[PDB]
């Protein structure tokens, strides 16, 4: 369903059908959390009335993290979980931590964004590698149940979301580094005019630019890829995987840049009447 | 055409302030700044035979300092555009895309002189701007005409 | 051939040719324009920013990620000339408004003009400096109480 | 008026150098025509607004000429023209873009 | 013409050069880090590597390995410097002298 | 205004007879619409300029009416209104588009 090229056949336990949750936290953009710096530009001691793809003030999340022990449902690959990429997504990802001889191992789930996920069109995969984040925009040949594996104390299965040992056509390939000891990671992914844009941050702040990528097509689907590990749950040291997403919308925000260029305040110009007054006069007072 | 009309109204206002005022050749505003214990020093620029006509009064200086982009501020704004001289101003980016402001045909020190002469014409012989009589006599007759004895 | 990613990067240099003080094209990280560069030290770029902007939407500075050096960008000069032309003459008189005559004789015109001076309005070519004289009617009014006769 | 040089008006970009370096000249004219029409529309609107401001400026200049001639240069038997009535006299002074 | 003051256009500035920067996506190939390898195979069991999805040029290559000749075939030597191929497949081995 | 009928405005020609005798009715609409838009923009600009000229004409008409009422049909205690002041009298005469 994700990819047609079949990879595995065992452990297709089918009966479990749990749903994505709904959080108890509205996204609040008063202190920058929910916004981003404008590509690779600097602004000093100003207010900017910026139109871009932002979240909506007062909206809730959906957890899409899936942890299997050894079993893989086909309802885990359904439009309950295979969602759509209309304008974009703002994401809040929990950074799970394991310890083998008191050595830190970070882990969370990877993410695929594409249209039909075959070897005739470009899909984007963002994948963690324990303090290293590798982004690859290529023509992968996706598995039927694309899934991942943990690497500290691993699972029984083999990590197989593609078998494409030929180095296929890649439009983008890069590596980035982040904090292993971090608590959350925030991610912006959107698309506009046939170009893909991506932003990330690890400390709670506005998210910083990762990359822009000119394609020419329109991505339509994304998927959080399910992980399979050894021991993370409550009988263990109480680790829990989370991946919260909220959609994006083309809307207007008012940003405040101090003299070193840090976003100190933002205003969603349609939350109230005072926000409309603030945004049409381009001032916070 | 709009700029021609602005030049014409500037010349008309300058014409009305000077239409029939006669002054003494022995005046000197460094010596004669007042009459009748009424002080006119803050209204007068300079005039005479040894001053140098580039002067405004006290009131005119107090008003021109609180407004930056006057006819002189525009000129010294555009003088700084070759190099920016800090980094940047809006007026140099405006003028480099074809939007300039021209100076008027009469400087504002000239209109300062024309209002100096309209002031001094009412305080000394022959009192041209006071209907021939001296200043405090004119005030007396004007208050008399309201119902005051 | 001619379809793919394994590209030869040479016929698309990326040298250290940040030549300040002159007007040059630029294609900086997607953004195109022309401008004048000037080397500086800046303290505000992070490891993901390479262009400086203002709230109007103009690009005003940048940081070359080949040399870790910061620069500021200024607009290049564009303007007109004011030609005061009297009938049956052979050449007009020229005013470059708000420009020093050193800048005009160096960076604009290298053509033979033996007469020039630096007036309050700019640089005057093909005319004599005779501001001590004065006139009461003029066809060629230049602004701020000056004229061409 | 200067901020009108950043609108696209239905074209792919607002930069002329971007259009002339990314398209082919039969397809570039279709984009430059939209920018030309939008910028000429902006200039026509500015020129009409200047033509309407100059009429108010001329009305004020004529009344200032009249107050110079009949409250400063002389005094007139009108009531409530200068001042408020019980008006005695009037002086004049030069001001940025006018007269005090 | 009559007497007047006219606003004549002058040519004002011409740009001297070009500047360029693009912060590339893909990673280089480092062909010369393979062509200067130590263990050179013999003409029975020559190697081959497929350098694809990266960036390269020629001048740093052909001055970083001690070239003695570089011919071409079905190609022009300056058509490398522009274009964008799809992969490159370098096969090296040592040479026995009399053959 | 008559010289606006020779502009092309982006079309292939400025003649309507040439567009209608060389193209097809789906293809000639694209060319006739550009001429229509350019000529209607020309007419709108002319009408805006006429509407702004009429206000200066009416201000001059009001001052001529007032000079007839108070320098010609009678004589006024205003100083520096007509003439120069030392003004004695004033006559009126008919002129093309006005009054002497
Ligand atoms: C880009 O992506 C596309 C995917 O969209 C890739 O294309 C895929 O390539 C696969 C090859 O790696 C291929 O898998 C299978 O193809 C073989 C050909 O199958 C035909 O011929 C058989 C002759 O024996 C015939 O039996 C078979 O019929 C079977 O299937 C049909 C349904 O398709 C049934 O109705 C029949 O009843 C029967 O069951 C086909 O007609 C096939 O032989 C292979 O299977 C054998 O090998 C397996 C591994 O060894 C083994 O597990 C299996 O049991 C068999 O022994 C092989 O699995 C995909 O079919 C093909 N997909 C499409 C849509 O074309 C493409 O390769 C990729 N490009 C690149 C460059 O990567
Ligand atoms: C990004 O970093 C990863 C490691 O986190 C690199 O992957 C390694 O690549 C080498 C050579 O290809 C292999 O020997 C290792 O086994 C790989 N490690 C893993 C965990 O896969 C990758 O090459 C880097 N990519 C870039 C573009 O820097
Ligand atoms: C040829 O390509 C080489 C590729 O190595 C270029 O050298 C690189 O320049 C960048 C820019 O600073 C450095 O980051 C790399 O480290 C350089 N490579 C090496 C091996 O040091 C070189 O500039 C190119 N030259 C020409 C003429 O095209
Ligand atoms: C410009 O500054 C960057 C720092 O942002 C330098 O990048 C560092 O380079 C060293 C050695 O090359 C690495 O060990 C660091 O990890 C790099 N830092 C980062 C953040 O990547 C870069 O070398 C500097 N360039 C010059 C020419 O001085
Ligand atoms: C030269 O080529 C050989 C391949 O034959 C490279 O050898 C590899 O060396 C690493 C060393 O850690 C081994 O782990 C690999 O197994 C070797 N590869 C093979 C195929 O045997 C060697 O690294 C190359 N030289 C350089 C400088 O890269
Ligand atoms: C997928 O492939 C495996 C072996 O490659 C085979 O056993 C299995 O039946 C295939 N499934 C389908 C649906 O073709
Ligand atoms: C299996 O699904 C049921 C209902 O869909 C749910 O209550 C249960 O928690 C699931 N099993 C596990 C192990 O979560
Ligand atoms: C902050 O912005 C104001 C806005 O004009 C400016 O005056 C001030 O200089 C800025 N602060 C610094 C430190 O530059
Ligand atoms: C931890 O220590 C044990 C024995 O001391 C060893 O077997 C194991 O591999 C170690 N783990 C790591 C991650 O080094
Ligand atoms: C995973 O791979 C290993 C070797 O690569 C193999 O021994 C094992 O059987 C594989 N497991 C599955 C479930 O395929
Ligand atoms: C982030 O990394 C820095 C140094 O790498 C470290 O000092 C800091 O504690 C890290 N953040 C957290 C939340 O641990
Ligand atoms: C983890 O959860 C278990 C189950 O409630 C609990 O007993 C244990 O104390 C927890 N760990 C910590 C460090 O609190
Ligand atoms: C009267 O005249 C003298 C000299 O002529 C003068 O100093 C004085 O101020 C005048 N006083 C009044 C009340 O006019
Ligand atoms: C013009 O530049 C000079 C020199 O930097 C400066 O002193 C002056 O204040 C500037 N004037 C304006 C109007 O910016
Ligand atoms: C001066 O100009 C007039 C144009 O009205 C021309 O007829 C006349 O010949 C000119 N005189 C000379 C000496 O060229
Ligand atoms: C003007 O020319 C001089 C040399 O004659 C040169 O040094 C200077 O950089 C030029 N200025 C500009 C702005 O091009
Ligand atoms: C122009 O002439 C005046 C007076 O003759 C003199 O003061 C001034 O310095 C002269 N300026 C130049 C540039 O010659």
């Amino acid at each position: 369903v994700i990819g047609d090229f079949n990879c595995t056949n065992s452990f297709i336990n089918d009966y479990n059908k749990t749903i994505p949750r709904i959080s108890e936290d509205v996204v609040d953009v008063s202190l920058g959390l929910g916004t981003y710096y404008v590509l690779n530009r600097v602004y000093l001691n100003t207010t900017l009335l910026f139109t871009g793809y932002f979240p909506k003030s007062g909206a809730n999340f959906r957890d899409l993290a899936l942890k299997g022990s050894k079993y893989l449902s086909t309802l885990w690959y359904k439009p309950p979980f295979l969602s759509d990429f209309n304008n974009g997504i703002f994401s809040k990802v929990k950074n799970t931590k394991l310890y083998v001889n008191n050595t830190l191992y970070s882990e969370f789930s990877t993410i695929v964004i594409g249209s039909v996920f075959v070897n005739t069109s470009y899909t984007i995969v963002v994948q963690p590698h324990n303090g290293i984040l590798e982004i690859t925009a290529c023509q992968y040949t996706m598995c039927e149940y694309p899934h991942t594996v943990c690497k500290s104390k691993g699972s029984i299965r083999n990590e197989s979301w593609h078998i494409d040992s030929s180095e296929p056509l890649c439009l983008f390939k890069k590596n980035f580094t982040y904090n292993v000891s971090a608590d959350w990671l925030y991610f912006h992914f959107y698309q506009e005019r046939g170009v893909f844009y991506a932003y990330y941050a690890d400390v709670g702040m506005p998210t910083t630019f990762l990359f822009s990528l000119y394609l020419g097509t329109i991505l339509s689907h994304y998927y959080v890829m399910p992980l399979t590990c050894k021991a993370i749950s409550s009988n263990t040291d109480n680790e829990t995987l989370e991946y919260w997403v909220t959609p994006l919308s083309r809307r207007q925000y008012l940003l405040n840049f101090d003299e070193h260029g840090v976003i100190t305040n933002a205003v969603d110009c349609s939350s109230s009447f005072l926000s409309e007054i603030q945004c049409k006069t381009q001032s916070f007072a | 055409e709009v700029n021609d009309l602005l030049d014409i109204t500037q010349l008309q206002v300058a014409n009305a302030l000077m239409q029939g005022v006669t002054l003494s050749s022995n005046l000197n505003t460094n010596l004669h700044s007042d009459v009748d214990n009424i002080d006119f020093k803050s209204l007068l620029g300079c005039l005479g035979s040894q001053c140098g006509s580039s002067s405004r009064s006290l009131l005119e200086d107090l008003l021109f300092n609180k407004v930056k982009l006057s006819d002189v501020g525009f000129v010294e704004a555009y003088n700084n555009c070759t190099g920016g001289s800090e980094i940047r101003d809006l007026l140099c980016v405006q003028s480099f895309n074809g939007i300039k402001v021209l100076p008027p045909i009469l400087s504002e020190t000239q209109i300062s002189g024309y209002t100096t002469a309209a002031t001094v014409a009412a305080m000394f012989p022959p009192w041209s701007a006071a209907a021939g009589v001296p200043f405090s006599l004119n005030v007396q007759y004007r208050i008399n005409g309201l119902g005051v004895t | 051939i001619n379809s793919g990613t394994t590209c030869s990067n040479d016929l698309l240099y990326s040298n250290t040719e940040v030549s300040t003080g002159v007007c040059v094209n630029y294609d900086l990280y997607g953004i195109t324009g022309q401008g004048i560069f000037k080397e500086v030290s800046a303290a505000y770029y992070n490891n993901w920013q390479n262009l400086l902007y203002d709230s109007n939407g103009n690009i005003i500075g940048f940081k070359d990620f080949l040399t870790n050096k910061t620069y500021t960008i200024l607009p290049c000069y564009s303007g007109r000339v004011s030609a005061a032309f009297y009938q049956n003459s052979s050449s007009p008189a020229l005013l470059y408004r708000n420009l020093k005559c050193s800048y005009v004789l160096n960076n604009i015109s290298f053509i033979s003009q033996p007469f020039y001076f630096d007036s309050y309005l700019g640089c005057v070519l093909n005319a004599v400096n005779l501001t001590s004289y004065s006139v009461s009617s003029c066809d060629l009014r230049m602004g701020s109480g000056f004229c061409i006769d | 008026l200067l901020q009108q040089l950043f609108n696209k008006f239905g074209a792919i970009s607002s930069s002329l150098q971007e259009i002339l370096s990314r398209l082919d000249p039969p397809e570039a004219q279709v984009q430059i025509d939209r920018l030309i029409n939008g910028r000429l529309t902006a200039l026509n609107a500015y020129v009409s607004q200047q033509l309407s401001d100059i009429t108010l400026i001329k009305a004020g200049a004529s009344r200032a000429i009249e107050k110079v001639n009949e409250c400063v240069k002389s005094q007139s038997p009108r009531i409530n023209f200068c001042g408020n009535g019980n008006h005695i006299l009037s002086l004049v002074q030069n001001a940025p873009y006018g007269l005090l | 013409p009559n007497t007047g003051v006219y606003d004549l256009s002058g040519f004002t500035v011409k740009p001297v050069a070009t500047v360029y920067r693009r912060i590339p996506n893909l990673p280089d190939c480092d062909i010369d880090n393979w062509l200067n390898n130590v263990s050179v195979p013999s003409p029975l069991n020559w190697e081959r590597r497929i350098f694809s999805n990266c960036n390269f040029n020629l001048s740093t290559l052909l001055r970083l390995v001690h070239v003695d000749s570089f011919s071409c075939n079905n190609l022009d030597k300056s058509k490398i410097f522009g274009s964008c191929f799809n992969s490159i497949t370098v096969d090296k081995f040592a040479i026995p002298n009399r053959r």
Side-chain angles (χ1 to χ4, degrees), chain A, chain B, chain C, chain D, chain E:
Chain A
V1 33
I2 310 297
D4 55 75
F5 194 71
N6 69 343
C7 302
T8 193
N9 42 64
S10 63
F11 318 127
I12 320 292
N13 183 282
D14 215 289
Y15 50 66
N16 239 152
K17 41 192 178 307
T18 176
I19 85 277
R21 296 100 131 275
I22 288 177
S23 64
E24 209 199 346
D25 224 272
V26 284
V27 37
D28 174 47
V29 292
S30 168
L31 292 179
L33 191 86
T35 37
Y36 47 86
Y37 292 81
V38 197
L39 314 154
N40 66 319
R41 339 170 144 180
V42 196
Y43 289 103
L44 281 356
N45 253 29
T46 181
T47 54
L48 190 68
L49 183 61
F50 182 53
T51 313
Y53 292 93
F54 297 99
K56 210 184 109 305
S57 176
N60 287 90
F61 300 144
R62 304 163 39 195
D63 196 5
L64 307 190
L66 289 173
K67 187 204 170 187
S69 289
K70 39 194 59 183
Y71 282 151
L72 256 306
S73 166
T74 82
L75 263 32
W76 283 6
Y77 296 92
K78 241 46 191 290
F81 289 81
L82 182 68
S83 11
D84 314 336
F85 193 93
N86 294 266
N87 310 266
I89 26 125
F90 174 72
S91 314
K92 184 173 144 227
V93 191
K94 208 265 164 292
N95 170 79
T96 65
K97 297 182 182 182
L98 282 316
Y99 280 93
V100 180
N101 317 7
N102 313 278
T103 343
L104 178 60
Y105 288 86
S106 317
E107 212 81 289
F108 54 93
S109 51
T110 104
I111 160 105
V112 64
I113 303 167
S115 169
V116 275
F117 302 91
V118 266
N119 33 292
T120 184
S121 62
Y122 282 106
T123 88
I124 301 109
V125 173
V126 183
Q127 187 161 62
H129 287 337
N130 193 91
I132 259 172
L133 186 69
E134 193 177 311
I135 310 182
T136 44
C138 303
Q139 315 196 10
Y140 281 126
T141 302
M142 301 302 308
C143 284
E144 265 227 332
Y145 317 96
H147 90 293
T148 58
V149 99
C150 61
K151 62 199 63 179
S152 54
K153 23 120 180 302
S155 110
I156 319 289
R157 299 178 74 119
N158 287 295
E159 173 187 10
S160 292
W161 45 278
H162 74 132
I163 169 68
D164 203 342
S165 60
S166 308
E167 335 231 319
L169 288 161
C170 290
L171 260 184
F172 189 92
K173 186 184 192 72
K174 235 264 223 310
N175 245 329
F176 303 96
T177 49
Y178 55 90
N179 226 330
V180 283
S181 59
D183 301 301
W184 303 84
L185 275 81
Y186 308 96
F187 284 92
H188 283 79
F189 296 113
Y190 63 95
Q191 59 142 158
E192 132 77 6
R193 251 190 163 97
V195 185
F196 181 86
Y197 301 90
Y199 300 79
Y200 113 97
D202 43 67
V203 53
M205 68 176 248
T207 65
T208 83
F209 191 66
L210 238 28
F211 69 101
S212 161
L213 171 73
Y214 175 67
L215 297 156
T217 108
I218 298 177
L219 319 168
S220 63
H221 291 74
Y222 72 99
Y223 183 53
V224 174
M225 195 161 293
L227 190 140
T228 304
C229 201
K230 216 189 201 77
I232 246 171
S233 181
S234 56
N235 59 93
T236 97
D237 212 9
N238 312 330
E239 302 315 286
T240 17
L241 196 43
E242 277 92 10
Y243 201 110
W244 310 91
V245 286
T246 152
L248 299 194
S249 20
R250 209 259 219 280
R251 56 213 288 102
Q252 229 170 10
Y253 271 47
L254 193 78
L255 315 161
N256 189 39
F257 298 94
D258 76 321
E259 85 223 30
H260 318 295
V262 194
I263 301 183
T264 59
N265 281 87
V267 155
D268 182 13
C269 308
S270 312
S271 3
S272 51
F273 297 105
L274 171 62
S275 294
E276 300 189 66
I277 295 152
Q278 279 183 314
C279 284
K280 92 187 302 174
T281 64
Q282 300 178 6
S283 174
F284 283 87
Chain B
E1 168 210 344
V2 168
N3 297 337
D4 281 325
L5 251 57
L6 254 33
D7 303 356
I8 268 170
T9 59
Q10 168 108 126
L11 272 169
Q12 288 176 21
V13 178
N15 168 265
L17 294 162
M18 297 290 263
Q19 176 57 75
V21 6
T22 327
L23 303 191
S24 160
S25 297
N26 294 261
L27 237 204
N28 196 314
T29 64
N30 307 138
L31 287 323
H32 320 295
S33 108
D34 83 288
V35 274
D36 299 332
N37 318 309
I38 305 177
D39 204 22
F40 281 75
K41 175 165 286 181
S42 44
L43 311 177
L44 289 161
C46 201
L47 190 141
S49 53
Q50 57 120 353
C51 212
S53 54
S54 185
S55 184
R56 332 187 187 111
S57 54
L58 225 62
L59 242 22
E60 279 165 17
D61 285 334
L62 215 71
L63 272 186
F64 270 77
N65 291 349
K66 311 205 196 327
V67 174
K68 186 179 182 180
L69 281 191
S70 21
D71 75 314
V72 137
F74 270 114
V75 169
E76 70 187 3
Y78 289 141
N79 277 7
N80 279 3
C81 286
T82 40
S85 179
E86 29 171 17
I87 173 187
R88 196 186 195 85
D89 193 16
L90 250 340
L91 298 188
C92 304
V93 195
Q94 271 166 40
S95 53
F96 286 162
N97 303 286
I99 301 167
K100 229 211 178 70
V101 179
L102 301 145
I105 61 171
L106 259 26
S107 58
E108 236 81 308
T109 111
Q110 288 183 338
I111 326 288
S112 277
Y114 303 156
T115 57
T116 291
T119 304
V120 117
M123 305 149 54
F124 290 98
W127 313 276
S128 179
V133 305
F135 178 73
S136 42
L137 301 195
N138 206 68
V139 180
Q140 276 169 199
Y141 305 159
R142 285 251 101 207
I143 301 175
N144 172 255
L146 290 163
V148 190
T149 88
Chain C
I1 195 208
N2 284 17
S3 65
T5 61
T6 310
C7 293
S8 153
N9 52 0
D10 174 278
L11 71 186
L12 234 206
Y13 208 63
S14 57
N15 47 3
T16 330
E17 232 63 36
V18 195
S19 34
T20 71
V22 312
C23 189
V24 277
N25 292 92
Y26 59 89
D27 191 10
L28 294 176
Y29 314 91
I31 318 293
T32 81
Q34 341 154 164
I36 297 174
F37 291 82
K38 167 163 160 58
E39 203 159 282
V40 82
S41 174
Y44 28 82
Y45 295 93
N46 284 251
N47 69 94
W48 26 280
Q49 299 155 314
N50 290 313
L51 295 175
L52 180 68
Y53 265 76
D54 64 335
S55 28
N56 301 276
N58 290 278
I59 163 183
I60 66 184
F62 95 109
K63 184 249 244 308
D64 201 354
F65 233 19
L66 258 14
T67 65
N68 288 0
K69 301 177 74 182
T70 67
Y71 308 90
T72 157
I73 310 167
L74 260 50
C76 298
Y77 169 72
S78 174
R80 284 146 121 196
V81 78
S82 298
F85 172 68
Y86 188 79
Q87 201 168 11
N88 278 336
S89 185
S90 53
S91 26
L94 311 174
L95 179 69
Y96 296 83
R97 288 182 186 274
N98 294 121
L99 289 188
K100 286 289 195 182
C101 289
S102 68
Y103 184 91
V104 172
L105 294 178
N106 285 330
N107 305 128
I108 296 186
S109 76
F110 274 111
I111 99 170
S112 302
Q113 291 272 359
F115 311 111
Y116 60 95
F117 63 95
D118 233 318
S119 63
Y120 166 84
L121 300 172
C123 183
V124 186
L125 320 184
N126 206 34
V128 205
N129 179 26
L130 211 57
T131 44
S132 68
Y133 185 79
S134 156
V135 104
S136 50
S137 65
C138 190
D139 341 66
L140 310 174
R141 319 212 238 259
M142 304 308 298
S144 282
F146 289 114
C147 139
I148 289 292
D149 222 60
Chain D
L1 187 62
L2 186 68
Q3 287 312 299
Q4 306 264 350
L5 290 178
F6 286 136
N7 306 330
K8 304 188 189 312
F9 304 116
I12 51 139
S13 182
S14 62
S15 199
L16 292 172
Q17 201 181 51
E18 215 157 12
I19 303 177
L20 285 169
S21 83
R22 287 175 42 206
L23 292 187
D24 284 356
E27 252 92 330
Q29 290 197 21
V30 193
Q31 300 294 282
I32 299 171
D33 202 56
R34 294 156 126 100
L35 286 192
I36 284 181
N37 262 277
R39 290 167 180 184
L40 291 172
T41 302
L43 284 181
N44 268 137
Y46 185 81
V47 144
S48 346
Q49 199 157 155
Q50 283 298 287
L51 225 36
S52 69
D53 294 4
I54 225 276
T55 326
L56 286 332
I57 271 132
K58 278 204 61 181
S62 73
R63 207 153 86 98
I65 287 169
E66 181 187 358
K67 285 200 179 170
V68 163
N69 270 334
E70 291 158 40
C71 318
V72 205
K73 244 62 189 321
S74 90
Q75 288 80 38
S76 194
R78 316 201 206 186
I79 323 184
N80 315 276
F81 172 66
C82 347
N84 72 314
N86 299 319
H87 169 260
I88 310 163
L89 60 119
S90 240
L91 296 149
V92 78
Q93 218 89 103
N94 191 43
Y97 316 98
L99 297 174
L100 190 86
Chain E
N2 287 339
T3 303
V5 174
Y6 307 94
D7 262 80
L8 305 182
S9 311
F11 67 99
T12 46
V13 289
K14 277 306 291 174
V16 168
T18 61
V19 205
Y20 206 94
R21 194 56 219 281
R22 218 130 240 79
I23 49 151
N25 316 132
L26 304 161
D28 320 354
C29 318
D30 238 14
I31 304 181
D32 62 327
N33 203 12
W34 187 63
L35 292 176
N36 289 329
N37 203 335
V38 174
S39 170
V40 187
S42 65
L44 238 62
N45 50 324
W46 43 267
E47 300 277 50
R48 139 181 296 192
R49 214 192 260 187
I50 306 179
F51 292 134
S52 70
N53 271 213
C54 44
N55 282 352
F56 83 110
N57 46 10
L58 245 54
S59 309
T60 293
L61 203 64
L62 310 179
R63 90 164 179 84
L64 242 163
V65 298
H66 192 294
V67 176
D68 278 27
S69 151
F70 194 95
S71 78
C72 270
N73 120 86
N74 298 291
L75 244 200
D76 312 319
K77 171 63 175 306
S78 89
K79 300 310 146 298
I80 287 166
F81 293 95
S83 299
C84 290
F85 314 108
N86 197 17
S87 47
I88 294 169
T89 323
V90 189
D91 326 316
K92 67 148 179 184
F93 50 96
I95 266 177
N97 213 343
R98 61 175 200 271
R99 302 250 31 112

